[PDB]
A paper describes a structure:
The SPRY domain- and SOCS box-containing proteins, SPSB1 to SPSB4 (also known as SSB-1 to -4), contain a protein interaction domain known as the SPRY domain, which was first identified as a sequence repeat in the dual-specificity kinase splA and ryanodine receptors, together with a C-terminal SOCS box motif. The presence of the SOCS box motif suggests that the SPSB proteins may function as part of an E3 ubiquitin ligase, with the SPRY domain determining the substrate(s) for ubiquitination, and this has been confirmed recently for SPSB2 (Z.K., R.S.L., R.S.N., and S.E.N., personal communication). All three hSPSB proteins share the same conserved SPRY domain fold with two short N-terminal helices packed against a bent β-sandwich, comprising two 7-stranded β-sheets.
The hPar-4 binding residues in hSPSB1 are completely conserved in hSPSB2 and yet the binding of hSPSB2 to hPar-4 is weak (Kd = 1.5 μM). Perhaps as a result, we were able to crystallize hSPSB2 in complex with the higher-affinity VASA peptide but not the hPar-4 peptide. The most significant difference in the hSPSB2/VASA structure is the complete lack of electron density for the C-terminal residues of the peptide: only residues Asp184-Asn190 are defined, compared to Asp184-Phe201 in the equivalent hSPSB1 structure. Overlay of the two structures reveals a likely clash between VASA Glu196 and hSPSB2 residues Glu55 and Gln116. The N-terminal region of the peptide is otherwise bound through identical interactions, with conservation of all interface positions. The amino acid substitutions from Gln116-His119 do induce a subtle conformational change in β7 and loop D. For example, the φ angle of hSPSB1 Gly128 changes from + 72° to − 164° for the equivalent hSPSB2 residue His119. However, changes to the neighboring hSPSB2 Tyr120 are minimal, with the lengths and angles of its hydrogen bonds to VASA Asp184 and Asn188 being essentially unchanged. Comparison of the apo-mSPSB2 structure (PDB ID: 3EK914) and the hSPSB2/VASA complex reveals only modest loop rearrangements upon binding. An exception is the side-chain indole of hSPSB2 Trp207, which is significantly rotated upon peptide binding to pack against the side chain of VASA Asn187. In the structure of the hSPSB2/VASA complex, these changes also prevent interaction of the VASA C-terminal segment, and a main-chain hydrogen bond is lost from SPSB2 Ala72 to the fourth Asn repeat residue Asn189.
Residue numbers in the entry:
A (entry chain B): 184 to 190
B (entry chain A): 20 to 219
The structure:
Amino acid sequence: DINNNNN
Amino acid sequence: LYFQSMPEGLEELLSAPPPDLGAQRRHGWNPKDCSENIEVKEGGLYFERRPVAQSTDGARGKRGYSRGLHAWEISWPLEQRGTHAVVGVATALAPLQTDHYAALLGSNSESWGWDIGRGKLYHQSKGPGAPQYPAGTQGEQLEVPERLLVVLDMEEGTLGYAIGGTYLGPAFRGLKGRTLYPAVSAVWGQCQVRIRYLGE
């Protein structure tokens, strides 16, 4: 996502 | 204006031979005092935040300071900051996690930080309207490079910062009587945030 996180 | 305001002893502290890696680890990130989504590496010298969505995650240093001069360099790559990257200090009581992206450090009475992305200061800060730091820029934001110095003067009770060796003034006052730990809050998946304690 926008913060390099895996949703 | 700026360096006219450095804590007493700061030039000397910085000019001395830096703490060895042992001292850096003893004052580094606490694996026992960080978000469940953060992994402390190299015994304290840096941490890596797991890529967990909808999470802001902080860490405290192993050592809390109540007296004397304390300075450490934070290294935080610009491409690993994301929407909310905050650098400062916290008491033992400040929360280390929340379940959305936010400026977690400084959003309460127990933490004080600089939003290195936006240039604002947060303490007890909820809504819009936090002040810009440093002053004297005519409202122009100062970009924060990869490395910055965080400077806690517990004799005067102030927290301030330096870029490129230049102290930018006290950001916060009224800190005397507290025990304060190095702290950051981070939202970026796989960010690596390094702490290098310099003394005293």
